[PDB]
Amino acid sequence: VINYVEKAVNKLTLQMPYQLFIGGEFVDAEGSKTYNTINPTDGSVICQVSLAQVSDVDKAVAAAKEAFENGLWGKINARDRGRLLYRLADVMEQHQEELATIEALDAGAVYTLALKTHVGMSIQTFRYFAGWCDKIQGATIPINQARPNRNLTLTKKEPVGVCGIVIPWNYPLMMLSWKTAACLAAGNTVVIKPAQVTPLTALKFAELTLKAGIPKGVVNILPGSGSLVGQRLSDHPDVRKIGFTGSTEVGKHIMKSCALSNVKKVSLALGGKSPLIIFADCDLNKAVQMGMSSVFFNKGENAIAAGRLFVEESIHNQFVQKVVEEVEKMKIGNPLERDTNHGPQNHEAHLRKLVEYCQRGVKEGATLVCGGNQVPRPGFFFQPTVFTDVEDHMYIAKEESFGPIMIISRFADGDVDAVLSRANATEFGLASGVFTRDINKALYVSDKLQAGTVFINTYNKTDVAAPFGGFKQSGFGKDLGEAALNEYLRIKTVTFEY
Amino acid sequence: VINYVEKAVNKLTLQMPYQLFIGGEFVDAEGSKTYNTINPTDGSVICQVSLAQVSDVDKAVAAAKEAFENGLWGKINARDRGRLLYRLADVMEQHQEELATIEALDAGAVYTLALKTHVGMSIQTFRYFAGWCDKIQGATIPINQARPNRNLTLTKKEPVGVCGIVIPWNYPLMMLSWKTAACLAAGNTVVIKPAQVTPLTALKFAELTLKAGIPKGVVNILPGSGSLVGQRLSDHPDVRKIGFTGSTEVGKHIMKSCALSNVKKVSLALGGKSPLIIFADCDLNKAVQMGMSSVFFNKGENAIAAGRLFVEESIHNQFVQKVVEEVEKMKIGNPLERDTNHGPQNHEAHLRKLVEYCQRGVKEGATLVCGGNQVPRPGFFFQPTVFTDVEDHMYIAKEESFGPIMIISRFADGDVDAVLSRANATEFGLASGVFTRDINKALYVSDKLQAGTVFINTYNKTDVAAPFGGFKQSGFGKDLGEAALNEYLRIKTVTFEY
Amino acid sequence: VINYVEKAVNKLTLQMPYQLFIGGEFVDAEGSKTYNTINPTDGSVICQVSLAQVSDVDKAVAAAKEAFENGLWGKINARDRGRLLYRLADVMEQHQEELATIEALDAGAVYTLALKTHVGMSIQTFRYFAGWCDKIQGATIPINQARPNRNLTLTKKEPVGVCGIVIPWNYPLMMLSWKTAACLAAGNTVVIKPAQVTPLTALKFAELTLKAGIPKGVVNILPGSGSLVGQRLSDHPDVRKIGFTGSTEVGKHIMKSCALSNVKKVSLALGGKSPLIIFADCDLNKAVQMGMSSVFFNKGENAIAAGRLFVEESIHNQFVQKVVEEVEKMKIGNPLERDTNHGPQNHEAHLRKLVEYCQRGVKEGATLVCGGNQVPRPGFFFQPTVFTDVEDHMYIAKEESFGPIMIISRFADGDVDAVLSRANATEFGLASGVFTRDINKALYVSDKLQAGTVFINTYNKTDVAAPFGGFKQSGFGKDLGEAALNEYLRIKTVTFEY
Amino acid sequence: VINYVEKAVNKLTLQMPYQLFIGGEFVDAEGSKTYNTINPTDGSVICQVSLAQVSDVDKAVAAAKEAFENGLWGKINARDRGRLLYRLADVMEQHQEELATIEALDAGAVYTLALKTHVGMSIQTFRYFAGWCDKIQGATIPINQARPNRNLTLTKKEPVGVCGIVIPWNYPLMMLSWKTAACLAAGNTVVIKPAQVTPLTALKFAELTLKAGIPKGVVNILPGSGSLVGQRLSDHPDVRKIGFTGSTEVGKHIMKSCALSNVKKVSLALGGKSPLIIFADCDLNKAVQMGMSSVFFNKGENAIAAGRLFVEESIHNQFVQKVVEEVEKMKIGNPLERDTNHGPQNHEAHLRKLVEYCQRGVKEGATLVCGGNQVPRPGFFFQPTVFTDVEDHMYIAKEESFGPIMIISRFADGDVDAVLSRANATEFGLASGVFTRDINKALYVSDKLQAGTVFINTYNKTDVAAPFGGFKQSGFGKDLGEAALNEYLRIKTVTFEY
Ligand SMILES: NC(=O)c1ccc[n+]([C@@H]2O[C@H](COP(=O)([O-])OP(=O)(O)OC[C@H]3O[C@@H](n4cnc5c(N)ncnc54)[C@H](OP(=O)(O)O)[C@@H]3O)[C@@H](O)[C@H]2O)c1
């Protein structure tokens, strides 16, 4: 029997585990330490969650090590590993409303969006990677023969072993799922650190691994701080790979910690300041819809959000006019209400950062067309914001807001290379977009954009089969697609002479 | 007109550049600083070589950046890039006797071996990777469709950009070639730091890039110290990838430096303590020949060298007797003499370490069967060495010698899992081997060995098509084969809606 | 309401459809023509089954064409096609006992075996290929650029369209499933012709596609003759691909019919005379168990069955003695008896062929050690048979029996090339095997055997992930694994200039 | 010493072999039979060429078989096979002017074009496939384990063995090179049948294999008739694969012959009636240039030639006007004159077909705008032809001309699906094209076109890396790219239990 926080909400009964998950059981942290998790809709405490300590990290890693080296997970067929992951996806689907409701409470995710994305994409991710298990293949290689003898060379794709996953708060279940699904499909075991502010779907997911029959110790979950729990994971001599998602500055630190301990493998999914270039020959009404989505999707708490819009001179004023018209139509409110399409920011400190961000934009001389403030209601709601007359040297032209702030610059009619130069003038390189009906412009621009993803006449169109990762200081390694598996596999070369 | 150090040796007239190679020209370092490169056969100075300074690194990176962004290398077809690399291999082959002679002088490489391996494999490396240029392919991916609209998702494989390569001294030209060929095949430009003690084949290679018509700035070479030149390469804001080969401890520092600057990508080819397990049912005479090769090849200056031999009890004494017999037949001498089997160690500091290594092995109680000493002759020669009665707790059971020291332990008749545990009880995981006629043992042992390469009834059988890289603290990433290309490529995902 | 033949048997009430399945409906054939399907355990008529006519073939192809061109199957996401195929596998699993019982009745498959293989592997097949749907990918290719313009070249993997599948009677559901799963996973629609003698699991399968929600017309099944139904399929102008499994001689005719009509694509999975080479250094008792299995599995009605055993001279007589001892322990009887090891042959005409085959073997001078005749009891049971003193010129050394007849020749110790020559002296090339503890022999022999599959120290180890197909007159193309998809996909190259 | 036909022409002294090439030597055919090859510029006899007989085919196949089974080609490293093919390309490059001159004489190929395409692309083809030799790789596959035992499954890519190549006359050297390069790269040996009318570059190529060091019997060349030599190749019991390029009707017969003998593998590169759709929103001047090229390139003797142009109503009249203007500027003349841009048709029988084709076009009611006739001069020149008012029911809307005949229909402004339906209403499916600046339209049309290749805003943009093959009655299998190798390889699955 597991202890739950129980809550009647959204036409169901939530049963939320709140403890650490280690070796297939929910357990208190050392000293029974706890912290409060906060509902961004009203600022209330949802419940108390165990606060993992260093000794809890060591217990989690030891359980993962034992599960990998001696448990059933390391013994079963890849096909049967696949079956278990497909079953886990099924169990997640059976609990989809509950999961999406927890995400609405914990992260401020609009419930209808959470059902399709936060939860829906997580389910797709597990099903996708479950199909990879028995299709992960090595090679046989035609090497030079040591005549008069013969040689056979093959490669074997093997698991890396114990992995650590450290993730942010914007899509709590989805960020966990991207990495966890690829990690488990490759045959590894894992210790996961959700962002401290958003532990609840991670702990519910943990319970679901029990319902699915995932062997004890394969999945371990440690609500807690990066500076304590995350650090220890990065430092641990039995951890062999870290999958990290978060800010560029913490990514640098994580990579350093991997180096100094045991040169554990690392992937880094970091910040972005993604440019969206909108040409005059696009479909304008569609550009407004997609451009708004590129910024405002999930209250802007979206790594790939367009952090800069470049709009061709001749359509700029009309584009801005239409955006403002549509922004006024947005329904801001409780993420559980069906008419809501703009939920609260994830937590109070982030709301404060956004308010300060827009003050700097005003101070430095950008035109605040609308928004810029907290919405005067309970919780941590921020107004959908539009800036114009943004110049390349401005702070808001350079810094990632990670909020619902559309930051608009002009470019001269007929310019192409000039705007590309401006769009590429960043140490980030996560995503980018271009709206145009012109085939030649679209292909040329996608060639020249210095970013890991280029959207053409769309935005936010991610897919579990399509690899996702950045260039430059947005990091390296992929989530999603076949490419993601490579972060969680090692290649052993075997060479015979006969 | 290039300045050479001219030398008449080995029935050739060597013409050796000695300056920095920056932007397609040989130039002096800042302040015309130089250092001496030492011939390990007699301890004499070969010549003075330019000593790169920080401002020289900045010039080399600037030249590489220009070559990539604006030069011809970034504009030509993949097919034509391949043609240039195949021409480069042809030029290397035209100069093969000269290159092997330089390697004999600089590194102490036995000339006949340098023709086949140090230089021979370097030529094969460029030809192999030349073939990859127009065969590097992205993907088209069947993503979910945004109905009633359609989506197309593709990936493009692109160059990473400016790379730094930092290498050691054991196979100076070949270590350079592995990384350089894959790096250039993928369309990058490069700044190479050879090991300070072995700059000469790198500088001759530089001149050969001119003969082959590699555009200026594509290849740049900076003899100098790791703590100065290598450090700056790892720190540089315009460098996007470091390919590193060296010790585990420097690898840790390199990775930290990549992290702290601009999270540049990194590959780490580090140290080894590779186990070779020899069962009683092997071919004994072959096991002796291959066992000796596993240790003594290239005077033991071989990262994959077997650093422990485990020999089954019933054949142990006969194995040792036969090795001693064969060791006594080895001809130690000038690497340029055709009858030489065993050349000098690479440099004096390394010889000193090997002497100390064997002193400690005797101190801690291992049986010194033969060798262990500097050979009484000029230069830095070390006697092929055999230790027996080695126990798992001993320093020589744990520490990488990187010299010609065969380190032998017994295991009990029939004790497969037990010997495997002993073989795996190391934080290294570079290579390994097993000698047995039994198919079931061979396959089971190769599954269980925790190493990036497993040799079965052979050793030292590397091939330009077979990926090479370690596990655990032997690093990550691959040199050679198709896999090596992934270190020098980035994947861009392009998603259309239409 | 679907009409069923109802039967109380094996603790179940079987509900067996018996009509043609066209466009999602069970329908009588033209003129309500029918034929009898026979139970091989007692020779009784199970029921009457609709007998497809030419107009019925045209209706099925029209339904398949409409389903492909305009129906839902052609419009849904690859991922969603995958979901439907997974659901089909789940439905088959929910009905596995019923399917295995039907296969016992219709094909004489031993019930316990049919659960694991005839049905269990069919289920694995659908689940395996379900996972491929959203992982079928094309390429982007670095072609030469038409300067000063640019080029993008990509490939798209597309379905071939309407396919015809024609199969034999030995594993009715499994042969169906292998091809159908790959065919549908690739996005095609299909008309299936089961062997006339074994229509029943195919028709139950058809009903399961309805339960699974496979869109109407995607799957169509036409019990009937090869010379009428199969012929029309191969001739039909709207069929673009035939997947054929059967005899070499019918395969020749089928390929010709494809040629003469519309050059439709064809795969050919044909006969075998597979050699198993057993060396004196094998584990003898294991060689006996696996050698017996290589021949007697599924009453010899197994295309990959070892059709000759070459047994090394020094172990031959002991091998034969052990085989005879084990053959005598085999329980022959009703496929529903849970201790049955050997069921009846599939149908009466095959039994008669096997009696004649053995008369011919004795006549030409082979030694009949045991078996060779019909078991005196109702139905069509044939004794497990062993021949020795078989020589290379003999009819039974050349001709495929497709029955439980072990055909043994000696070979001399210390020649390997000589036994290979004898093993390779056939126009078949489907499978082969080698039993030896010697790694060098195993690897060399596997290199030299001229067969699409080589088993080493095992036999009949097929797997849904491992491609299966023959060489020479055993045909071409693969069932199973990733390679099977290529028979059901076409590649479109798309080249842009911009 | 080889017998040559010597010819002083194009400022060169041509040395043309004229005999059969069998087992590394030029020999007369059985009975010294010969036939005349005809210069299409003036209708004169170039020289007498040996006429291969059945016994000569048997000798070639025996030589290919011995070279494969016992000769050096079957023994050398894949890497060394690649070196030989690169060397072959180099020799071809050293002879490029001579080869292009021979092609001008034999096939009427315009010299400047033959240099770039006929010969230039043949060279690229051998270099490209030379690079594949040591990069052809099999797999290791994660199959279900027969617990308590373990299984390893791998695939080996092997050569198919002796191949027959049967080709047409439009690009004699290039068609040979496409197939021969892939065939040899995969490790096979080959007997080549050039079109009887164009044997000369094939025989010169044969001599170049000698210069390049290709082992005797690896390449064998038999000038002669399809009905005799081609037939025997398709019939031969030792040939295991036919690579065929030619008409759809001969393709059907070839496939039938493959079936009836030994089910040898076959690829079919057959005819085309490829549609080019030109929208009003294209760049009109570029559409005219590329539209011209799509029809007139290599005097229309181009399998992928656009056989229908569909031009949008609003630009149709202007397109036709501009085409007529450009057609009038074409210089018809001797292929060796530098100002010629339209050479003679390949041979007399083809010229006659083209005359009849245009007669039937006029008869059935199409508007003949220009050409349609043999040019009044010696040889077999044909006037570049333009037809308009072509309706879907007409012969020239359905039948492949394989000549310089532009066949134009209108489609209504704003129609897309309607014109696609018309473009797809053919049993051919080789190539196609679309000209439009609209990204949505270009992507949609490329999805919907039922053809193996789709060109977007270009035409005739083939590449050695880009796979090329048809759908429907245009055949199956690819030439060029990685995909081409699959036709010349077989996959062996090796499964161990241990
Ligand atoms: N590229 C992508 O796929 C992607 C996706 C989502 C978000 N992001 C990026 O993430 C950022 C937003 O999240 P954030 O600013 O909250 O990120 P953050 O501060 O970098 O935190 C990310 C995670 O790192 C942990 N952490 C902090 N210090 C650590 C340490 N010393 N050792 C180990 N772990 C440590 C944090 O723990 P705490 O819970 O204690 O903070 C948290 O779990 C944005 O820049 C956004 O673009 C990127």
Sequential DSSP letters for A24-86: TEEEPPGGG-EEEEE-TTT--EEEEEE---HHHHHHHHHHHHHHHHTSGGGTS-HHHHHHHHH
Q: Do D252 and C240 touch (CB under 8 A)?
A: no
Nearest to D277 by CA among D427, D432, D389: D432
Fold assignment, D272-463: Aldehyde Dehydrogenase; Chain A, domain 2 (3.40.309)
The minimal CB distance from D77 to the residues A145, A437, A440 is found for A145
Distance CA A255, CA B257 (A): 10
The size of chain A, in residues, is 498
Q: Do D139 and A134 touch (CB under 8 A)?
A: no
Distance CA D160, CA D129 (A): 17
Residue ranges around ligand 1 (CB below 6 Å) = A 166-170, 175, 193, 195-196, 225-227, 230-231, 234, 245-247, 250, 253-254, 269-272, 303, 400, 402, 430, 470
Instruction: Say how many C-beta atoms besides its own lie within 10 A of residue D321's C-beta.
Output: 12
Distance from CA of A460 to the nearest CA of B (A): 10
Q: What are phi and psi of D453, to 5 degrees?
A: -135, 135
Distance CA A55, CA A30 (A): 7
Which helix (DSSP H) or strand (DSSP E) does residue D166 occupy? strand D162-166
Q: Helix crossing, B96-107 with B200-211: angle to 10°?
A: 160
Return the bridge partners of C368, or none.
Answer: C387
**Residues of chain C positioned with their CB less than 8 A from the CB of D478:** 491
Q: Are the CB atoms for B135 and D463 separated by under 8 Å?
A: no
Nearest to A253 by CA among A231, A223, A224: A231
The size of chain D, in residues, is 498
Matching residue, tokens 């998950």: A21
Q: Do D79 and A144 touch (CB under 8 A)?
A: yes
Return the bridge partners of D476, or none.
Answer: D268
Task: Give the pair of three-digit tokens for residue C55.
Answer: 């107009």
Nearest to A181 by CA among A137, A216, A129: A129
CB-based contacts of C277: which residues, under 8 Å, 6+ apart?
C310, C411, C419, C420, C423, C432, C433, C434, C435, C445
Q: Do B451 and A492 touch (CB under 8 A)?
A: yes
Ligand 1 atom with least separation from CA of A166: 43
Residues of chain C with CATH 3.40.605.10: 6-271+464-498
Distance CA B85, CA B209 (A): 9
**Residues of chain B positioned with their CB less than 8 A from the CB of C489:** none
Distance CA D51, CA D48 (A): 9
Nearest to A408 by CA among A391, A420, A433: A391
Distance CA B197, CA A248 (A): 37
The size of chain B, in residues, is 498
Task: Give the pair of three-digit tokens for residue A285.
Answer: 């009404």
How was this structure determined? It was done by X-ray
The minimal CB distance from D498 to the residues B124, B135, B443 is found for B443
Task: Give the pair of three-digit tokens for residue B209.
Answer: 């890039």
* DSSP three-state, residue D299: helix
C310 to A464, B287, C155, C445, D165: CA distances (angstroms): 51, 32, 47, 13, 38
Ligand 1 atom with least separation from CA of A257: 32
In terms of phi and psi (left: phi > 0; alpha: psi -120 to 50; beta: otherwise), the region of C400 is beta
Ligand 1 centroid to residue B266 C-alpha, Å:
21
Distance CA C376, CA D14 (A): 81
The answer to whether the bond into B404 is cis (omega within 30° of 0) is no
Ligand 1: which residue has its CA nearest to atom 9? A246
Residues belonging to chain C with any Cβ–Cβ distance to chain A shorter than 8 Å: 79, 82-83, 86, 124, 127-128, 130-132, 134-135, 137, 150, 152, 439-440, 443-444, 447, 465, 482, 496, 498
Q: Are the CB atoms for C191 and C203 separated by under 8 Å?
A: no
Chain A / chain D CB contacts < 8 angstroms:
72
Which helix (DSSP H) or strand (DSSP E) does residue A424 occupy? helix A417-424
Nearest to C333 by CA among C182, C85, C108, C25: C108
Residue of C nearest to D256 (CA): C256
Residue of C nearest to B443 (CA): C439
Distance CA C385, CA C392 (A): 19
Q: Longest Cα pair distance anywhere in chain A, in angstroms?
A: 84
At what resolution in Å was this solved?
Answer: 2.0
Residue of C nearest to B134 (CA): C142
The minimal CB distance from C440 to the residues A124, A130, A498 is found for A498
Distance from CA of A13 to the nearest CA of D (A): 41
Q: Do A439 and C498 touch (CB under 8 A)?
A: yes
Nearest to B168 by CA among B262, B53, B298, B28: B298
Q: Where are the alpha helices (DSSP H) in C108-247?
A: 111-114, 120-132, 172-185, 200-211, 231-235
Q: Where are the alpha helices (DSSP H) in B188-273?
A: 200-211, 231-235, 248-262
Q: What are phi and psi of D387, to 5 degrees?
A: -110, 140
Return the bridge partners of A245, or none.
Answer: A269
Q: What are phi and psi of A291, to 5 degrees?
A: -65, -40
Nearest to A269 by CA among A302, A313, A222: A302
Nearest to B122 by CA among B200, B175, B161: B175
Q: Are the CB atoms for A433 and B494 separated by under 8 Å?
A: no
Q: What are phi and psi of A19, to 5 degrees?
A: -100, 170
Taking 3-state DSSP, the helix, strand and coil percentages for chain A, each rounded to the nearest 5, stand at 40, 25, 35
Ligand 1: which residue has its CA nearest to atom 8? A246
Ligand 1 centroid to residue A274 C-alpha, Å:
18
Ligand 1 centroid to residue B258 C-alpha, Å:
19
Distance CA D51, CA C75 (A): 55
Ligand 1: which residue has its CA nearest to atom 2? A269
Q: Do A134 and C150 touch (CB under 8 A)?
A: no
Q: Do A496 and C439 touch (CB under 8 A)?
A: yes
Taking 3-state DSSP, the helix, strand and coil percentages for chain D, each rounded to the nearest 5, stand at 40, 25, 35
Q: Which CATH number fits domain B6-271+464-498: 3.40.50.1370, 3.40.605.10, 3.40.50.10440, 3.40.1190.10?
A: 3.40.605.10
* DSSP three-state, residue D372: coil
Residues belonging to chain D with any Cβ–Cβ distance to chain A shorter than 8 Å: 77-79, 133-134, 136-145, 154-157, 436-440, 442, 456-457
Ligand 1 centroid to residue A226 C-alpha, Å:
8
Nearest to B136 by CA among B489, B468, B466, B467: B489
The answer to whether the bond into C148 is cis (omega within 30° of 0) is yes
**Residue type present at position A496:** F
Nearest to C109 by CA among C18, C173, C204: C173
**Residues of chain B positioned with their CB less than 8 A from the CB of C80:** 144
In terms of phi and psi (left: phi > 0; alpha: psi -120 to 50; beta: otherwise), the region of C204 is alpha
Distance CA A142, CA C127 (A): 33
Distance CA C161, CA C183 (A): 9
Distance CA B425, CA B430 (A): 13
Ligand 1 centroid to residue A162 C-alpha, Å:
21
Task: Give the pair of three-digit tokens for residue D364.
Answer: 């059935």
* DSSP three-state, residue D155: strand
Distance CA D393, CA D405 (A): 18
Q: Do D137 and A140 touch (CB under 8 A)?
A: yes
Residues of chain D with CATH 3.40.309.10: 272-463
Q: Do B438 and C442 touch (CB under 8 A)?
A: no
Task: Give the pair of three-digit tokens for residue C103.
Answer: 């296969």
Distance CA D385, CA D369 (A): 7
* DSSP three-state, residue D303: coil
Q: How many CA atoms lie within 13 A of A186 on its CB side?
A: 31
Return the bridge partners of A47, or none.
Answer: A37
**Residues of chain A positioned with their CB less than 8 A from the CB of C440:** 498
- Touching chains, D (3+ CB pairs < 8 A): A, B, C
Q: Do A137 and D136 touch (CB under 8 A)?
A: no
Instruction: Say how many C-beta atoms besides its own lie within 10 A of residue A44's C-beta.
Output: 12
Distance from CA of D494 to the nearest CA of B (A): 14
**Residues of chain A positioned with their CB less than 8 A from the CB of D130:** none
Q: Are the CB atoms for B344 and B380 separated by under 8 Å?
A: yes
Distance CA D394, CA B464 (A): 59
Ligand 1 centroid to residue A245 C-alpha, Å:
6
Nearest to B86 by CA among B137, B125, B117: B125
The minimal CB distance from C453 to the residues D255, D478, D493 is found for D493
**Residues of chain D positioned with their CB less than 8 A from the CB of C248:** 263
Residue of C nearest to B77 (CA): C144
- Chain centre to alpha carbon of residue C243: 11
Distance from CA of A75 to the nearest CA of C (A): 18
Distance CA B73, CA D135 (A): 24
Task: Give the pair of three-digit tokens for residue C394.
Answer: 């003999």
Long-range CB contacts for residues A113-117, cutoff 8 Å, separation at least 24? A113/A298, A114/A335, A117/A171, A117/A174, A117/A298
**Residues of chain A positioned with their CB less than 8 A from the CB of C498:** 439-440, 443-444
